[PDB]
Design an enzyme around this catalytic site. Structure first.
Site, PDB file in Angstrom:
ATOM      1  N   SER A 141       0.890  -1.302   0.091  1.00  0.00           N
ATOM      2  CA  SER A 141       0.101  -0.001  -0.077  1.00  0.00           C
ATOM      3  C   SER A 141       0.949   1.178   0.023  1.00  0.00           C
ATOM      4  O   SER A 141       2.044   1.408   0.967  1.00  0.00           O
ATOM      5  CB  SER A 141      -0.733   0.200   1.072  1.00  0.00           C
ATOM      6  OG  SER A 141      -1.632   1.144   1.224  1.00  0.00           O
TER       7      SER A 141
ATOM      8  N   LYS B  70      -4.763  -6.438   3.492  1.00  0.00           N
ATOM      9  CA  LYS B  70      -4.678  -5.263   2.487  1.00  0.00           C
ATOM     10  C   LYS B  70      -6.247  -5.035   2.029  1.00  0.00           C
ATOM     11  O   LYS B  70      -6.356  -3.694   1.964  1.00  0.00           O
ATOM     12  CB  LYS B  70      -3.914  -5.708   1.125  1.00  0.00           C
ATOM     13  CG  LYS B  70      -3.953  -4.796   0.111  1.00  0.00           C
ATOM     14  CD  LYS B  70      -3.362  -3.722   0.479  1.00  0.00           C
ATOM     15  CE  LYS B  70      -3.057  -2.680  -1.015  1.00  0.00           C
ATOM     16  NZ  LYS B  70      -4.537  -2.578  -1.700  1.00  0.00           N
TER      17      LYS B  70
ATOM     18  N   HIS C 146      -7.645  -2.763   4.563  1.00  0.00           N
ATOM     19  CA  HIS C 146      -7.009  -1.517   4.557  1.00  0.00           C
ATOM     20  C   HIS C 146      -7.813  -0.764   3.546  1.00  0.00           C
ATOM     21  O   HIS C 146      -8.101   0.257   3.760  1.00  0.00           O
ATOM     22  CB  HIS C 146      -5.572  -1.651   4.098  1.00  0.00           C
ATOM     23  CG  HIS C 146      -5.012  -0.138   3.638  1.00  0.00           C
ATOM     24  ND1 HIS C 146      -4.260   0.627   4.414  1.00  0.00           N
ATOM     25  CD2 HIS C 146      -5.207   0.353   2.507  1.00  0.00           C
ATOM     26  CE1 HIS C 146      -4.083   1.870   3.852  1.00  0.00           C
ATOM     27  NE2 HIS C 146      -4.557   1.590   2.509  1.00  0.00           N
ATOM     28  N   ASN C 147      -7.912  -1.570   2.406  1.00  0.00           N
ATOM     29  CA  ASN C 147      -8.759  -0.573   1.151  1.00  0.00           C
ATOM     30  C   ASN C 147     -10.367  -0.180   1.464  1.00  0.00           C
ATOM     31  O   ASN C 147     -10.758   0.835   1.388  1.00  0.00           O
ATOM     32  CB  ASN C 147      -8.596  -1.494   0.034  1.00  0.00           C
ATOM     33  CG  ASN C 147      -7.249  -1.340  -0.641  1.00  0.00           C
ATOM     34  OD1 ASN C 147      -6.297  -0.429  -0.242  1.00  0.00           O
ATOM     35  ND2 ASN C 147      -7.026  -2.051  -1.813  1.00  0.00           N
TER      36      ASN C 147
ATOM     37  N   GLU D 258      -9.590   2.851   3.997  1.00  0.00           N
ATOM     38  CA  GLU D 258      -9.551   3.931   3.057  1.00  0.00           C
ATOM     39  C   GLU D 258     -10.806   4.444   2.571  1.00  0.00           C
ATOM     40  O   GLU D 258     -11.208   5.790   2.474  1.00  0.00           O
ATOM     41  CB  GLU D 258      -8.601   3.472   1.929  1.00  0.00           C
ATOM     42  CG  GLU D 258      -8.381   4.512   0.935  1.00  0.00           C
ATOM     43  CD  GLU D 258      -7.557   3.893  -0.194  1.00  0.00           C
ATOM     44  OE1 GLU D 258      -6.575   3.404   0.196  1.00  0.00           O
ATOM     45  OE2 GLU D 258      -7.919   3.814  -1.471  1.00  0.00           O
TER      46      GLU D 258
END
Ligand code: GLO
Lengths: 466, 464
Positions: free
Chosen positions: B126, B181, B184-185, B188
């Site tokens: 990232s 990941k 995390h997206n 976001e």
């Protein structure tokens, strides 16, 4: 002697469908993998033309050809196992109807495989609960039209009938279309039950109504535009007591269970790009209710406000009523928009007015409300969103202030209103010609060089923001 | 021979290769298209980048146990690249997939490759094209032994947090890294939507100009909200179009994502987790993409106009507090999902360590991540971040502002889906009794589904 139709699966819905079919004058073979349940059905229904079978071979051999077999078994592995068991005994041309709550992609695969093997297959939703399965459910079949025409007579005999005389069954579309529509019906049902639950939270939290007053309130609401099966049963639930004098509603554990079609509708909205916020928040509300131990622990450590003054009793009740009806309208506008997106993606050319028509009776979401949708679709078959239809648009004009007042009151009072909240946010986003997504697009270009489009010139652009 | 090679010379791969080379290593590079490989070499003369134009020569160029960083585009080009490597690999070699891959695909590949004697690390990377080049946050899962073998290289290319710790750590087995990941997206998307609602409130309610919005976001960025996304937002509001006008005002408001933004929410739905804020953030992008429908509806549907905002400084402070508490709720939902995923997929995740690698390099980097790291250090198996002392205090102090902001927005016609979801979640999670008792009664009435009782054990059914 052979029987005319056979039913596999003797749990409540399947047993009741078998009795529904027998009540129309047909002789019915029944079979269940747990044989003791078949014995129970026979013992409980002396006098009915049900004939029990204890092996699949004998069940299949008992049927007039071409055979008509209705499967009402647990979705998933159980249904595939039931079909695989029948196959070796069938003849080409036999008719298999899967009436379980099957995921639509499984029906698309099965329809392909079974049609290639020469069987006539129908994947159909059946809605109505225990009483509707017995007396007349809504039936939503998909598959090849030739297969539907082979079973339409019997499905019409057993389906609910609307007050205008129209049977609550119609050809939905190709392959998995019927099970997709049943999934959306269940998603709408989840949303209607969560909307009603929020109205209950508001009346109890804001006015401290007793269960008797809650039943009276829901009775009054059921006499007007909100009349529906779900509100009619709610009014009954609030006066039911157990053998000891306890209101049942107050001793039932608040952990809402589910069997998946709620999650499936929302996972499909996510795959199709549809903003199905209200039904999805209803699924999440069931999920947080299922974290009971965590909620009990958190209730002892997290702080919050107390309910605020509600003002005049009758005025507050009418605002909650209007919030509930406009919430329903938003939920159904989102659900019918998803039906259009699914029809386009899966190539079904769905007839939205006909789908609403079969939900006017039989199914759990039945209500005169479904006639309002049927009529808006009749007037404009490819309407993009029900909020644009005059009837719905004008209810939103008249009732949106009550909805806004109810949400502001609930938020200031600490009463959770996920679906009423979502309904306001969706109405205010859908009518917005410009949203703050311009900033989101600028951020994506800044940190990831994703490019953006402009409102004053053609093409894609990338900027050095610093 | 080289200690590591990179396959896929599109932008992410080339940048990772340059990052590694920049640390003192010589790197073998290869690409399916001979052209891109040639193009890369030219652009960086003097950098120790050894080009190979055959998969065989590429693989033989590497020191065993071979470490091959695969930066092809997540898709089917990943199984193709692995399919082509297999015949030249030796038992023990390690393939590292740095694509934004769906974690179930990584679970499948790790299982298949292991059976053939190869290691497979699926890793999130990232930070953007630029982050890959200077120092990304790296989230690897797969065989721990394989991770420890390549860790010296990963620790040197990762971003570094304030305490000197590199933003990389072993996440867990098989697909754990690509799962983190993905989360995390999702987080976001939630942070961007929360900021977008704050922008809507400030512009629609106070009529702030772009300069005032930049000034406001700059002030917020000095305190507890300090984050990369707020820092870039104040830059965006300052950017003028080559004609003296602001560029953000002419950007089409149709938010993309590319078919992957929905994964976190679909996993929440599979795991039984109430991930409402991130999911409303995905639906807010979806409705922005329905622009033709929104414009048609705007000419038909009616609504209120913005209500009196009251004192300016007070309104701005309430929006600030709402934004911070909304972020806390979104992360509380996301970390609870990480725990449910760890249980389902058997990963024994270390939540504090995950928060630590998000302190720098990644898009959600912010001072805030240290508060989550602190809470998890004190209590590694905390069920929900809202229970931690720091977060309970912020919720006690800021909830009234969040409630005032949502009520104002709703009376003003300003959509606030994630601020709304944050209040609903907070008020539901702290509620010992919810109206699900009526839902259970209804399910028993119409479908005989049975229900449990609060005063007796067992399952009951009522003839209603
Ligand atoms: O409410 C959820 C129930 O678990 C689910 O099974 C369906 O709603 C069903 O149609 C009821 O018969």
């Amino acid at each position: 002697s052979k029987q005319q139709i056979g039913v596999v699966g003797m749990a409540v819905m399947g047993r009741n469908l078998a009795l529904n079919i027998e009540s129309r004058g047909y002789t019915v073979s029944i079979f269940n993998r747990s044989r003791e349940k078949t014995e129970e059905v026979i013992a409980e229904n002396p006098g009915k033309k049900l004939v029990p079978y204890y092996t699949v071979k004998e069940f299949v051999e008992s049927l007039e050809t071409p055979r008509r077999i209705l499967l009402m078994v647990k979705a998933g592995a159980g249904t595939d196992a039931a079909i695989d068991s029948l196959k070796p005994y069938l003849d080409k041309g036999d008719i298999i109807i899967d009436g379980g709550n099957t995921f639509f992609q499984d029906t698309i695969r099965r329809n392909r495989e079974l049609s290639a093997e020469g069987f006539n297959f129908i994947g159909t939703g059946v809605s109505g609960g225990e009483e509707g399965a017995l007396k007349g459910p809504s039936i939503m079949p998909g598959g090849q039209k030739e297969a539907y025409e082979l079973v339409a007579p019997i499905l019409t005999k057993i389906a609910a009938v609307a007050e205008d005389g129209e049977p609550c069954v119609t050809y939905i579309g190709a392959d998995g279309a019927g099970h997709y529509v049943k999934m959306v019906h269940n998603g709408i049902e989840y949303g209607d039950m969560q909307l009603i639950a929020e109205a209950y939270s508001l009346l109890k939290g804001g006015l401290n109504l007793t269960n008797e007053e809650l039943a009276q309130t829901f009775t009054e609401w059921n006499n007007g535009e909100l009349s529906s099966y779900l509100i009619d049963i709610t009014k009954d639930i609030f006066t039911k007591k157990d053998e000891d004098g306890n209101y049942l509603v107050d001793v039932i554990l608040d952990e809402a269970a589910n069997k998946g079609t709620g999650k499936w509708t929302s996972q499909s909205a996510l795959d199709l790009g549809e903003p199905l916020s209200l039904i999805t928040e209803s699924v999440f509300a069931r999920y947080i209710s299922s974290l009971k131990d965590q909620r009990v622990a958190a209730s002892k450590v997290l702080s919050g406000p107390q309910a605020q003054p509600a003002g005049d009793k009758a005025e507050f009740i009418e605002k909650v009523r209007r919030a509930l009806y406009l919430g329903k309208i938003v939920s159904y506008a989102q659900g019918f928009s998803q039906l259009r997106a699914a029809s386009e993606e899966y190539n079904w050319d769905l007839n939205y007015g006909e789908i609403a028509k079969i939900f006017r009776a039989g199914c759990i979401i039945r209500a005169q409300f479904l006639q309002k949708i049927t009529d808006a679709c009749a007037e404009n078959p490819q309407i993009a969103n029900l909020l644009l239809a005059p009837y719905f648009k004008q209810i939103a004009d008249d009732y949106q202030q009550a909805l806004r007042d109810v949400v502001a009151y609930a938020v200031q009072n600490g009463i959770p209103v996920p679906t009423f909240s979502a309904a306001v946010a969706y109405y205010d986003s859908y009518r917005a010609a410009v949203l703050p997504a311009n900033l989101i697009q600028a951020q994506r270009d800044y940190f990831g060089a994703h490019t953006y489009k402009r409102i004053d010139k053609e093409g894609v652009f990338h900027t050095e923001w610093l």
